[PDB]
Amino acid sequence: YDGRTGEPIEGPIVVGQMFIMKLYHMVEDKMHARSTGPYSLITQQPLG
Amino acid sequence: EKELLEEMKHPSRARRAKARKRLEVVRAFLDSGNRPEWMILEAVPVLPPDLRP
Amino acid sequence: KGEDVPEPSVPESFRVLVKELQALALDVQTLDEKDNPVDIFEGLASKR
DNA sequence: CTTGACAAAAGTGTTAAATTGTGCTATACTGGGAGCCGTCACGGATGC
DNA sequence: GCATCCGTGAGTAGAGAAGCACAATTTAACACTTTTGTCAAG
């Protein structure tokens, strides 16, 4: 059944219990932004 | 250049090809005004210290 | 200040490249429409 | 607005210790050392 | 003509082991004025 409408899904759905892992790649550790910051010594370009 | 032009008239293809290689280098110096002995360094330029910090 | 960013200037990396090319005993000079030398170092590398 | 004079701040000339640069060691000693390796195709030249 | 050595190139992000003597030069501790800066006086 669809929780939004209460009507059934028009076809039977494969529903079961499966083992799912949470991986080390998390958006918390990967989101980054910068307006201005440190620059390189020689090229004077922003660091990485 | 004059000597290399004379060798350019040689009937051997290899001789003309070798003369062309030399004459391209010779004409490059003549047209640009570069002086061939400048390819040997007497004073070595030193890079500014902030580029080698 | 609420203003538009000004017109950009020569990158500092190009200045680095020119000086590094000069360290290789190569005379790299920027010219104008009339083939006259143009100073991209703001007179800071010209000896008097 | 000038004293004015006055102490702090700063400059300055010596003098010392400290740091730094240089010379010198007299049995005889006389040609180094580490690598050494599993890519492949491509010009370009260099001679054969 | 061909065979060989050398030179070139081979994706982008991010994350990651001598002492010692002595001279010569410099530093730092002093003293010294000399100089600004300042709070009384009109």
Side-chain angles (χ1 to χ4, degrees), chain B residues 8-53:
Chain B
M8 208 73 192
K9 314 159 180 298
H10 196 265
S12 181
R13 309 169 178 179
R15 291 287 63 82
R16 300 188 281 93
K18 158 177 171 46
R20 185 183 63 260
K21 310 298 177 53
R22 300 192 58 192
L23 183 62
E24 287 162 348
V25 179
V26 173
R27 287 165 176 256
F29 278 104
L30 282 179
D31 304 346
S32 63
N34 286 328
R35 182 74 274 171
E37 53 263 23
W38 298 349
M39 293 184 290
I40 296 90
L41 305 170
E42 297 181 357
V44 173
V46 178
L47 192 75
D50 285 2
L51 308 187
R52 39 174 185 85

Side-chain angles (χ1 to χ4, degrees), chain C:
Chain C
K1 293 182 183 293
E3 294 179 353
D4 204 7
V5 301
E7 293 310 0
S9 185
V10 64
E12 192 74 6
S13 309
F14 180 64
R15 287 197 182 121
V16 167
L17 167 76
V18 168
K19 280 315 175 183
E20 292 179 352
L21 277 170
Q22 288 191 355
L24 283 165
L26 301 179
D27 182 11
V28 178
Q29 185 62 254
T30 61
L31 310 176
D32 61 345
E33 295 86 357
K34 299 293 183 182
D35 280 358
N36 297 123
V38 169
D39 189 62
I40 65 176
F41 298 103
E42 294 293 328
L44 296 181
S46 58
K47 300 195 310 184
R48 323 118 337 211

